[PDB]
Amino acid sequence: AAHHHHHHSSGLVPRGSHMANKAVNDFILAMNYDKKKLLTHQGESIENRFIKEGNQLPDEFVVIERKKRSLSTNTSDISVTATNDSRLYPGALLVVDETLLENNPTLLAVDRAPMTYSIDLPGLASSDSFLQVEDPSNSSVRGAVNDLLAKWHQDYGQVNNVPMQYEKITAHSMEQLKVKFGSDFEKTGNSLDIDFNSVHSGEKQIQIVNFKQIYYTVSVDAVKNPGDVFQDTVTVEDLKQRGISAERPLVYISSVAYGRQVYLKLETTSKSDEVEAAFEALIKGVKVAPQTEWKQILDNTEVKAVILGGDPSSGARVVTGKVDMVEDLIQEGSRFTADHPGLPISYTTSFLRDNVVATFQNSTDYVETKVTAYRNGDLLLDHSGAYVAQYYITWDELSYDHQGKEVLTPKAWDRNGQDLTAHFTTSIPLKGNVRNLSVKIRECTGLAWEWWRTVYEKTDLPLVRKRTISIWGTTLYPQVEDKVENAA
């Protein structure tokens, strides 16, 4: 007796019956899977073997120290890069597999039961926040939301000045960026034209800034029973036909954030350690003095950006140029108006089975490259004395061997020890290479009991941009000037 109740004598479960929805509900509840393992991905996992490198650039000598780092993110927020993604609407059903991890999700588009949404809008009434969509799709949900928006803007609603939020990192690897911003980021990074090669060779430094402006978010309350999102026309076999199982379970978009997003690239050829500070000052719109080190950095900074939402169409703009246009990028989407509903920039998913928020674990190993720059310099000599003079100029040229060991190669001015006469001038180019610079200058007095007189003798001379050593005067009273020009 107990076997037959709530069942058809045919033994079949009729399509469009309450029995069908019940079977679907039990079918999803019966699923046993590991939530974390299904949403976990590993990046590269590099090994810690690195040697110190030295390289000569046209204007400077760089010392590069490579190091393996680890970046691991564990978030439920999924960044949106697609423009008009029909799949990414509130309450949409997504399949849990590789495609969900890659942010190119598989939409489960079956007959949907009505769903109730709430929207958090600054200056929106309590019970006017709810929306009842009878047949959830991208269109029906988008329409219901925009209808509420249009009403909310035309009725009243202050032009809410939207807060700007941003997170930033120093670029190193494309994989590392993907862990930080999402695995769909590769499209954006290619638009930003990030020069990873020049970073690794220490020729330039990159910082990536992600701006977010959330106008509003649409949310879905917890689903009581897994089968409550399906119409009775949906059967268990229908789900299996589309490959739904405990191994490929279901998830629903529990909320979507709407507004404007900006991925910013700050590309500087500087090797300074004040780069992060200079970039920050730029973002804050802080005035920069011309003779500062920051101004040197910012003048040599190329800026590219991808705009998602705000201003014109929904389409993504790829603006390019100098530092001057960063300020307007930030101010552009400051106000949320009737002109633009705003578009999805972020969404979150919850498992259909138990409404637990789906959290994605991503990690990767990357090489953190440090670069230390030593500027080239020139050593200038001027001989305007009434005497024969000799120079003894000597230095070491620094290099690094294939084992990263430090190497000092002795060097000497080819005209050392030679008798030089006024008016003699010369310029000796010295690379950042140079350590332990020593200059000795002596003069022939003509006196039999003391033929030579030292006019100048310094060791460990700093490699400034321009050092001019000028000698003049007489055999008995020689004069010397050690003039340094190293101002920025």
Author numbering: -17 to 470
Show passages lifted from the paper:
We also deleted Ala146 and Arg147 (PLYΔ146/147) in the loop that would clash with the last β-strand of the central β-sheet. X-ray data were collected to 2.45 and 2.5 Å resolution from crystals of PLYD168A and PLYΔ146/147. Superposition of both structures on PLYWT showed no significant overall differences, although a detailed comparison indicated small changes in domain D2, helix bundle HB2 and in two of the D4 loops. Around the mutated residue in PLYD168A differences were restricted to sidechain orientations, while the deletion of two residues in PLYΔ146/147 caused significant conformational changes in the loop connecting helix α5 to strand β7 of the central β-sheet. In PLYΔ146/147, one loop connecting D1 to D3 is also slightly different (red arrows). (A) Ala146 and Arg147 in the loop that induces refolding of the last β-strand in the central D3 β-sheet into helix α13a in the late prepore and pore complex. Deletion of both residues renders the toxin inactive. Even though the structures of PLYD168A and PLYΔ146/147 were very similar to PLYWT, they displayed major differences in their membrane-binding and oligomerization behaviour. PLYΔ146/147 was not able to bind to the membranes at all and had no detectable hemolytic activity. The pivotal role of the loop that contains residues 145–147 connecting helix α5 of D1 to β7 of β-hairpin one is underlined by mutant PLYΔ146/147 that was completely inactive and did not even bind to liposomes.
